[PDB]
């Protein structure tokens, strides 16, 4: 009898919201959820099906997964975590209204105290460890599911974690995204300037990665070329074949070296001489 995640949380794109914003914060998308067809965090209870309950809280990203200061706001969410009863008719369960509510910096200690005072510690981490710095732009969902044993008594299953979810409000952990582009073709000799409009990026941690089978290169530019974190003016790299005689499509995408993240690919076409 164990909990299995069959649909992880999308890791990037959603921003953590503060209390001061709308009462109804965001809702954590699935991972395969498409602009048209949306999906949500989904677990399956293997080796069991029937009555019981499920709780979801927030733990840090790294190993000693301690209670996280942020709160998991949304339907059936209180004191920082969501809790509701499982449907005895199904073994697969998805949650469509989970939202990270990021705390302010100066309420960090209060937040932890509320985690202790509330007995929210899925991994029963020593209390002396709940004092160390906390990464506030990354959290992990934690599924504490409780079933029933043959004696028909409460049986708390072993805690399971999802992939980490990052604060999109934060450029370093944000989802990379090319919004608009000057031109999408150029000579296989390179040297064509391109104006690229994008979501917030950190000039000291960004790249334009040109990709094709057997060919990898980068757009040329300097930090001075990054306009207010949202526009990049660069020069195209030379394609491999210096004497193309027909358009060859290749991929162009934003790359973040710190965590080697990549943006969805944009199509670029190299043309002859």
């Amino acid at each position: 009898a164990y909990v299995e995640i069959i649909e992880q949380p999308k890791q990037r794109g959603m921003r953590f919201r503060y209390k001061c914003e709308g009462r109804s914060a965001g809702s954590i998308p699935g991972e395969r959820s498409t602009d048209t067809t949306k999906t949500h965090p989904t677990i399956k209870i293997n080796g069991y099906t029937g009555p019981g309950t499920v709780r979801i809280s927030l733990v840090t990203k790294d190993p000693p997964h301690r209670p996280h200061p942020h709160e998991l706001v949304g339907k059936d969410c209180r004191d920082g975590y969501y809790e509701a009863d499982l449907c005895p008719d199904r073994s697969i369960h998805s949650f469509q209204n989970l939202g990270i509510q990021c705390v302010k910096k100066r309420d960090l200690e209060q937040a932890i105290s509320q985690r202790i005072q509330t007995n929210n510690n899925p991994f029963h981490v020593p209390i002396e460890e709940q004092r160390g710095d906390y990464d506030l732009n990354a959290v992990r969902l934690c599924f504490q599911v409780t079933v029933r044993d043959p004696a028909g008594r409460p049986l708390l299953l072993t805690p399971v974690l999802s992939h980490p979810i990052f604060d999109n409000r934060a450029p370093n952990t944000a989802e990379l995204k090319i919004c608009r582009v000057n031109r999408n073709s150029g000579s296989c000799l390179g040297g064509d300037e391109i104006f690229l409009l994008c979501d917030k990026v950190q000039k000291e941690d960004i790249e334009v990665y040109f990709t094709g089978p057997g060919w990898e290169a980068r757009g040329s530019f300097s930090q001075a070329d990054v306009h207010r974190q949202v526009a990049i003016v660069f020069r195209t790299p030379p394609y491999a074949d210096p004497s193309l005689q027909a358009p060859v499509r290749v991929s162009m995408q934003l790359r973040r070296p710190s965590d080697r993240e990549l943006s969805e690919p944009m199509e670029f076409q190299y043309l002859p001489d």
Partner: protein, 312 residues
């Protein structure tokens, strides 16, 4: 008669109102005519050179009804919100070098306000028309902390509440006032006060200095309808437009505007538009002209940028 007058109005734009947290030394309201590193500065002058003189200054609102603003003059001999100087010396032209404008937080507007209104009552140098006309009968007279009538102290906490509700913190004004020597050696001979030109905080997107940082293209066909990517400083997608202009012989009256919806404005820092058709789509030699960012609100512009039009 003896009256006051200003010799160099405060530069209306290019200065940011510093919050407390911002910290010390950031700048200091520049003199309107600071064309170069001539480190300009505001300067008032009393006409009827009355030997010893006293000139003060407190910030005020920019609306129709002149009142006491919540922001305060910090630099120079500026204490508790207002600056004070002397004019007894060899001349009658006081200046005001280095003295920033502190930006107050919104929650603390009502507080600071009532606290600078009461102070405008238990302190002579402050009028009684900036707090409430029904109080003018309190002009410059004596000093020393005391308690104001609890009958009038209430209307004070009332004016605050009614003047906090619509106070614009992005703009402030200077209220210059001169007091002459009286009969008891107390500078309380008040001369008609004079307000300055509205100073705008170089942080409110609707009063910041406009600027084209770069364009992917600086030339286009006279036919127009060509897409251009323009990078600029903070602007507001609803109060902005790109104007192209040319100064002809009969006074350059020709202008055109870049075509674009607001969705074409990227995170306030970039605009992608289409060039406007040039006046004569029949020219045979290139026509050099200028492009500039212009705020649709205050019709304020950015440094004109050269744009070349070439034959179709």
């Amino acid at each position: 008669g003896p009256y006051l007058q200003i010799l160099e109005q405060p530069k209306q734009r290019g200065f940011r109102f510093r919050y407390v947290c911002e910290g010390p030394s950031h700048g200091g309201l520049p003199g309107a005519s600071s064309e170069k590193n001539k480190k300009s500065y505001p300067q008032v002058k009393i006409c009827n050179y009355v030997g010893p003189a006293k000139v003060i200054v407190q910030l005020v609102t920019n609306g129709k009804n002149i009142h006491l603003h919540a922001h305060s003059l910090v630099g120079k001999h500026c204490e508790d919100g207002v600056c004070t100087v002397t004019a007894g010396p060899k001349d009658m032209v006081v200046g005001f070098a280095n003295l920033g404008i502190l930006h107050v937080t919104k929650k603390k507007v009502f507080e600071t306000l009532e606290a600078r209104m009461t102070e405008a009552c238990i302190r002579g140098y402050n009028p009684g028309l900036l707090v409430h006309s029904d109080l003018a009968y309190l002009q410059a007279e004596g000093g020393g902390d005391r308690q104001l009538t609890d009958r009038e102290k209430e209307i004070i906490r009332q004016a605050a509440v009614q003047q906090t509700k619509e106070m614009d913190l992005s703009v402030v004004r200077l209220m210059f006032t001169a007091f002459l020597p009286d009969s008891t050696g107390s500078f309380t001979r008040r001369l008609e006060p004079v307000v300055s030109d509205a100073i705008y905080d170089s942080k409110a997107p609707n009063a910041s200095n406009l600027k084209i940082v770069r364009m992917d293209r600086t030339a286009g066909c006279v036919t127009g309808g060509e897409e251009i990517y323009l990078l600029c400083d903070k602007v507001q997608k609803d109060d902005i437009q790109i104007r192209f202009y040319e100064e002809e012989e009969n006074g350059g009256v020709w202008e055109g505007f870049g075509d674009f919806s607001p969705t074409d404005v990227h995170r306030q820092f970039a605009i992608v538009f289409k060039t406007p058709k040039y006046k004569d789509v029949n020219i045979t030699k290139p026509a050099s002209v200028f492009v500039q960012l212009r705020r649709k609100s205050d019709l304020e512009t950015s440094e004109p940028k050269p744009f070349l039009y070439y034959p179709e």
